[PDB]
Design a binder for this molecule. Structure first.
Ligand SMILES: *[C@](=O)([C][C]C1=[C][C]=C(C2=[C][C]=[C][C]=[C]2)[C]=[C]1)C1=N[C]=C(C2=NC(C([O])=O)=[C][C]=[C]2)O1
Ligand SMILES: *[C@](=O)([C][C]C1=[C][C]=C(C2=[C][C]=[C][C]=[C]2)[C]=[C]1)C1=N[C]=C(C2=NC(C([O])=O)=[C][C]=[C]2)O1
Ligand SMILES: CCCCCCCCCCCCO
Ligand SMILES: [Cl-]
Lengths: 546, 545
């Protein structure tokens, strides 16, 4: 009963292979004509510098484009992050608006950013051979700003996962260690940007999907307020779920690139192409501010025990923020377990997962999804009974299961109102301490391939901020030491359930992997959040290229 | 079992009575100290000039406040629009921030704008004797801008109505004609502002509730995009419904007053007090633009037959815009019957009315609600059966009834997605004609008392824009002539169902009543919408500017 799904996989792998072949040919031809180009100097230029030399005419767009193309092709060899070469991008190159803020910049796109003539499969059989009629809005805006979107990058099947494998294009690997997940669902971006194959990409995030891959692969990512940027024309898999909104945002090698991307997207072109997005221009004066901050912080959410490296990462950042004159205030949003188990999970699965499951009918289920599909398929009464049996021993498992049940419109209204009140509760708590921003641990180091799907509880650090719909970003601040890695051996977790047990095993053998912290500000405060992310980057990686 | 509802009404009426008495004494006390005050001239100043005089010192806040207070008390005699005098507002008056953009302006509040120490009953027994414990955010911002909120005004019971009666405070009457509804649910505001008792107020709107009372009473009103202004701290009766967007906004005697109010609300105070609102400052330059406009228009929505006065109002306004060099382009949002019957109604009533109905347990149901409560109370199977029976002769009634049935979360997601797709579809139409703004009929003239609850169909002109969540304001442009009124005898409606029959009768006997047009722009374009409203006001009623 999988013939259709096998045929879709066969055609998708053939398209991926042919894309890669096309990229290689274009690259080899370019290198023939240009044997004297210093490609290493060009590839190691920070985006802002890259942009400046593209604008001044010191670098040609062709040079930058084919140099990134070959790098992307090369890093793909060991990561399998690229699903499709966006075909006509060479012609887009020659027609790029010369005064665009991203003129001549190659940009990589997560597969869900619809690009005319191309599938956005999400790794799902039912989406194969359905090429988009047109570019999504953000892609249009990138082009109107002179950028050159050039590849679609891999995502885990359906995107509802923080790993990164699907039955069409297979598994994407972390560039730091191939037995490690790159994170997800923007895992292709994480792996590609993290190994130098792209200077800028866009991802999406409903529970951490920009933040996980950024942290796991050692790059910067920002998830803005859900409606800060346009979602018009994006390929999705669940429609009309609005309790927990999806957010899209940039990933890149440094904080300044995230700021440039946001500044480029937040222009009249975006606001007129999608009038539903509030026309809030990028406030540069807020981003470039350098006043002392009141910084709320916590070392642990009391839900996911942090790895020793996560905890050290957080504490060292707190300490340097304090040495730099900031005020560090202990702070923890109230009722995190409610936010995760009841509001987030309830919001995401208000219908018991039926709408989500339509996607999987007649399809393989990628091992990286774990038992998610099997669990969602259980009848409501059975989820209920099983939840009751589990409650005494494993309350966390029980609480998630009970909240993944279908319910009436009436109860959805009640849930939406609760999400709304919880958001005001945390806003009030934040204002009572007069915080400017909030510093939190970020999940890391990277988990073994195919383990994120068995360690659901670990979305706690990021998913809290989709529930709250606050802008939240991540910045790499350290790498796992031998001592961090040895101490991980005593890791117990707060619950001792299967999620805690998997997390300890999945983080084994991590010496050298990047570890991040998370930076949060209030709704619509992307500029302040980025200002704070820049501060953490200046202090924790003082040797990063200007 | 009605002892509780009766008790609630007795207490509410005694409170209202004590408030009016407190106002009377304050007013008389002031008048004795100020015998030479030209009250008429003060009451007549357009708000803009009033603000300017208060800021310079030419007028004292006390003179402005007590003069409006006496006017409010006088006009309430014949309208019953005031439910409560906001007690401490006299102290607020002496403390108003001197540089506030609304320094010394008295502001009237629809009863649902929570105000510390005061009930927001919504005309419901279960809310009586349960005072708010804090000002809602917009009241806070008004006060931080130096304004003096001074009264709560009446609403129809629960607010789900475009009439204005409840069993607690009773019935509000149109100030132009006592047999007429002032509209609603922001009806107390329309009646108070429209009779000169308040220079500025705030209403709310989920299907027209700012626009109905504005049109019916002859004043200007704006329903912004749902999340342009903070709803934080408002009193409601249905919580968590997000398919069809609730909006709050200003009502006033002229367009400039709405623009001033928005400019004062859209400040740092608002944006820090409620970070969930996008911090979009009022773009003065967009509001002040005098560039020619591409104005889409329609003179009927093919759902509610416009009255002859509505029709003429629309066409005359169209012709004056053409004469002033604007480009008038025929435009009708696609699939209106679907947007109204499936999306809007299904959105408002996704749970079959069960949450709404909880508010009425143990309470009288005001006659102005008509059969709404009785209908919502019916078992889903029976709504469905009755819908089948009506379908062949009365498709509209059948459609509303079927779409007011409860459903699963899964069905609500599907509806939400359809709403989102529908909104993009109208945006796409608008883009393909390169419109700046859209001009539509506004329901009018005012309906007879106790008939809006029996003519649900007539919400079509306004509710479409809550569904789409576009900013939409109305501007008075003409008044009903005997000619317009006699032509009501030829009005048939497009459907001939009970709604069309009720509406035909209810709109008669309206000679001399105000009639408006509606002005619409794209989401977040309140300033452009106001720019257009200003244009209409200037071309049809030059005296306002
Ligand atoms: C990522 O943010 C997904 C990360 C993630 C979120 C939630 C869970 C989870 C929570 C509770 C129980 C089981 C699993 C695990 C991992 C991301 N990126 C996109 C999406 C997403 N997009 C759509 C859409 O339609 O565009 C729908 C669902 C998810 O999630
Ligand atoms: C007004 O906009 C009410 C005008 C109105 C809207 C809809 C209907 C209707 C539609 C279909 C079937 C039956 C009736 C009739 C009149 C207004 N102002 C506030 C509200 C409102 N507020 C809340 C809340 O909780 O704040 C809830 C419901 C309605 O409606
Ligand atoms: C929950 C605490 C507030 C209850 C006090 C009395 C109720 C006043 C209602 C006005 C505010 C609407 O949310
Ligand atoms: Cl919004």
């Amino acid at each position: 009963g999988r013939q259709k799904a096998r045929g879709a996989a066969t055609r998708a792998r053939q398209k991926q292979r042919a894309s890669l072949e096309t990229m290689d040919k274009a690259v080899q031809r370019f290198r023939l004509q240009n044997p004297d180009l210093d490609s290493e100097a060009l590839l190691t230029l920070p985006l802002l510098q890259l942009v400046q030399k593209l604008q001044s005419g010191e670098l040609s767009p062709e040079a930058v484009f084919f140099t990134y193309l070959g790098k992307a092709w090369e890093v793909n060899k060991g990561t399998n992050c690229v699903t499709s070469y966006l075909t006509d991008c060479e012609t887009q190159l020659s027609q790029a608006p010369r005064q665009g803020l991203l003129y001549g910049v190659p940009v990589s796109l997560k597969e869900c950013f619809s690009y005319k003539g191309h599938d956005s499969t999400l790794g799902l059989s039912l989406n194969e051979g359905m090429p988009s009629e047109s570019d999504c809005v953000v892609v249009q805006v990138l082009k109107l700003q002179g950028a050159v979107p050039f590849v679609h990058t891999n995502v885990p099947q359906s995107m509802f996962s923080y790993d990164c494998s699907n039955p069409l294009f297979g598994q994407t690997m972390n560039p730091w260690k191939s037995s490690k997940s790159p994170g997800g669902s923007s895992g292709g971006e994480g792996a590609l940007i993290g190994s130098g194959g792209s200077p800028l990409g866009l991802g999406t995030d409903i529970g951490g999907s920009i933040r996980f891959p950024s942290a796991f692969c050692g790059i910067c990512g920002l998830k803005p307020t859900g409606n800060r940027l346009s979602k018009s024309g994006l390929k999705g898999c669940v429609y009309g779920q609005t309790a927990v909104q999806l957010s899209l945002g940039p990933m890149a090698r440094d904080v300044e690139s995230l700021a440039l991307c946001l500044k480029a997207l937040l222009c009249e072109h975006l606001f007129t192409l999608d009038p539903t997005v509030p026309p809030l221009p990028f406030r540069e004066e807020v981003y470039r501010s350098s006043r002392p901050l009141r910084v709320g912080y916590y070392e642990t959410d009391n839900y996911t025990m942090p790895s020793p490296a996560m905890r050290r990462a957080l504490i060292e950042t707190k300490q340097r923020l304090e040495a730099a004159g900031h005020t560090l205030i202990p702070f923890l949003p109230n009722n995190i377990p409610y936010a995760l188990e009841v509001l987030s999970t309830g919001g995401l699965f208000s219908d018991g997962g039926r709408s989500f499951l339509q996607n999987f009918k007649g399809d393989f289920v990628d091992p990286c999804l774990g038992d998610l599909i099997l669990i969602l398929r259980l009848p409501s009464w059975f989820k209920r009974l099983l939840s009751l049996l589990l409650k005494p021993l494993f309350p966390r498992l029980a609480a998630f299961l009970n909240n993944m049940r279908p319910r009436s419109a009436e109860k959805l209204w009640k849930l939406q109102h609760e999400i709304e009140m919880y958001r005001q509760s945390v806003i009030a708590q934040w204002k009572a301490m007069n915080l400017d921003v909030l510093l939190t641990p970020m999940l890391g180091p990277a988990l073994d391939l195919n383990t994120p799907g068995r360690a659901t509880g670990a979305v706690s650090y990021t998913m809290l901020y989709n529930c709250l719909d606050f802008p939240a970003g991540v910045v790499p601040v350290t790498t796992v030491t031998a001592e961090d890695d040895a101490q991980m051996e005593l890791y117990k977790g707060y619950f001792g359930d299967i999620w805690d047990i998997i997390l300890k095993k999945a983080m084994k053998n991590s010496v050298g992997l990047p570890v991040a912290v998370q930076c949060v500000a209030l709704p619509w405060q992307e500029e302040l959040c980025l200002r704070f992310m820049r501060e953490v980057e200046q202090l924790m990686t003082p040797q990063k290229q200007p």
